[PDB]
């Protein structure tokens, strides 16, 4: 719907202007565009990530920070796209072999006091949470597809650049092009990222008396 696309574009523009306009310092000393310069230096170093503080975002635009707290799954995609285009306008022109723009991972952090694993009740679902713990296990790095292309097995038609939802959730392949399951996923024409599952044990200070330590 055009209204929905307008909402997404407006929120993306607001995140873009946050990354373009945010400053730290005073007129008595000087100003540095914190996230502009972080984006530029990280992209030129080939890092392709930044670390947006929730308190800074709240100070610039409290509504964006509240939306990102309540609905991070929706709005982090817009924030990452905003960071990508800000990186484009901040870095270009680029030398040979660096013409194609790379995706930017917008990590984020907060000064707020953290919650705990046993405090994570059902009402915290799909919200931002901040919990401490100890890593007890760490998986080997495995590849997860972020975009795929699927080719019909019978007639060799192709659907390309299907956006995969982030996280451990998957994607449902269409049942219409042919057979009931017409498609296979093309192993070459898909883009993947590293992912790693961890087990986060509750802090021994945080375990209630007589309990075993939970893990998440």
């Amino acid at each position: 719907a055009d209204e929905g696309q307008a909402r997404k574009s407006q929120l993306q523009r607001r995140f873009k202007e946050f990354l373009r306009q945010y400053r730290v310092g005073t007129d008595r000393t000087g100003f540095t565009f914190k996230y502009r310069d972080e984006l530029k230096r990280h992209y030129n170093l080939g890092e392709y990530w930044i670390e947006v503080e929730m308190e800074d975002l709240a100070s610039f635009d409290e509504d964006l920070a509240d939306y990102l707290y309540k609905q991070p799954a929706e709005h982090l995609q817009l924030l990452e796209e905003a960071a990508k285009e800000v990186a484009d306008e901040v870095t270009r022109p680029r030398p040979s072999g660096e013409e194609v723009l790379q995706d930017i991972q917008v990590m984020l952090k907060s000064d707020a006091s953290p919650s705990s694993i046993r405090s994570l009740k059902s009402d915290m679902m799909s919200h931002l949470v901040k919990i401490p713990g100890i890593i007890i296990a760490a998986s080997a790095v495995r590849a997860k597809a972020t975009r795929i292309s699927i080719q019909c097995r019978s007639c060799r038609n192709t659907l390309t650049n299907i956006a995969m939802r982030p996280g451990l959730e998957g994607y449902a392949l269409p049942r219409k092009c042919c057979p009931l399951d017409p498609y296979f996923i093309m192993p070459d024409k898909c883009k993947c990222v590293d992912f790693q599952t961890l087990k986060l044990q509750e802090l021994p200070d945080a375990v209630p008396h007589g309990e075993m330590p939970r893990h998440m």
Partner: protein
Amino acid sequence: MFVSDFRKEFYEVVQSQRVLLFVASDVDALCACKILQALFQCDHVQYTLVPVSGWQELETAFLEHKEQFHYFILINCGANVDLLDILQPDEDTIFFVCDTHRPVNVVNVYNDTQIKLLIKQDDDLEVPAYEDIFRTMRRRQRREWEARRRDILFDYEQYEYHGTSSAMVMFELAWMLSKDLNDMLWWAIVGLTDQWVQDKITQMKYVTDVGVLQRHVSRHNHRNEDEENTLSVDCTRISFEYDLRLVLYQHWSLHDSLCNTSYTAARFKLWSVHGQKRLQEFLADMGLPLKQVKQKFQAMDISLKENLREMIEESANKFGMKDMRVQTFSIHFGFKHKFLASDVVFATMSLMESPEKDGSGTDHFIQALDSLSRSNLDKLYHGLELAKKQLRATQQTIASCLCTNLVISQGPFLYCSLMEGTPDVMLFSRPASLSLLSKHLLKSFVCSTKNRRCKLLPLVMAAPLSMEHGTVTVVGIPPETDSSDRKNFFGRAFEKAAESTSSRMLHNHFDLSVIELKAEDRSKFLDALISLLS
């Protein structure tokens, strides 16, 4: 003499001269010093700035500097004593005195040639006439005149108190010079808020001075901004606020601020085991979730922050806290920097009264003075952290004193003392923090006790100063009542008790109600005070 016009007969005089600033170590003095520093730096006045915190230090610095400087400015010191007697200056020197201390000493009032007072003549002043103070039947008439003199001088010098803020006086001078910056106005506001925070002035006078500074804030805002087009976000924007009395609530969790504000802590008795349940009654009346109240305020949900002031006010009204809202100001600059005047007061005060045994008290003064400039904002935030520690230690000390019942009646006044080696007695060894602690402790005590007579008493509080010299600081606080004039007699009472006892009292502090005693002298000194107050 009183200076009638600061511009002509003070500023235009010293503008042509080398000057020496002596400044007391209090936040109002620091703000007045900053304003005067900025004026002098605009006009290239070659000043020298010296911190002081007691009469011995001022005397030492003046003896060191008397040969080179002829023009001296004393900020928040010197008015309530005979400066000529104390300092012994050459007759060609001139002392300007921008001091909030009252009553002004009559010698300073009527010395026309040498002592010039940067004090408003429309302040609350009741100076006696010259003929009443300065020069067979003629012998009998002379002796009768001397009896009149001693009676009227005692009536004049009995109660000490504080007048208009020195920072406000210096900002008035800056306004008359037409060189008033927005930061100078903020320093004036912080100077007034220092008096209000330390309870040096009445609520009526504070409201009147806030009414004065409201016009200056409006003028500065409309100097270059209106409701149609506005300044950059970088520019400082001072706004009048009818805000909450809670201390540092925008940098804390609301739970911590309700815990460590003296007002709410005294009301709910949070030192007591039952007080947390009373606080939970209050929070449940407001309907704030505890997980939100115990979260930091900047991370609290904006749905709760939308109308928190009205919620706290209307719950405070039915819980019996009648004046939870206060008239004050805040300053905003950049995207993320927001402070109340009380916040800057507490941060600067904690920097100055910091308990760290590094360098010297002048060093802590220097850190506090630097923190009042926006180029040293990191020092201001560090001062806010030190203010967190100071307020927590204050409440711990109050809880210890009330639980162990150190606060005890001794007839016409309550008495308390801190023992050596107890937790965080070091933080209150310094006299200024001790005075603030005594005020908070007396408020907690009168809110706690059921005895209506004990609610009317003043407080005398002591703490260790120097074990190697075997000395204790002692302070005197008037009764804590809603309608108090914030006048106290403990200066003259301490002096007369010490004289009547031949006590080893060192009177080094600028407030007469703050003294140093040799420790073993305390018993006969307290007995003398009991017999004196009767």
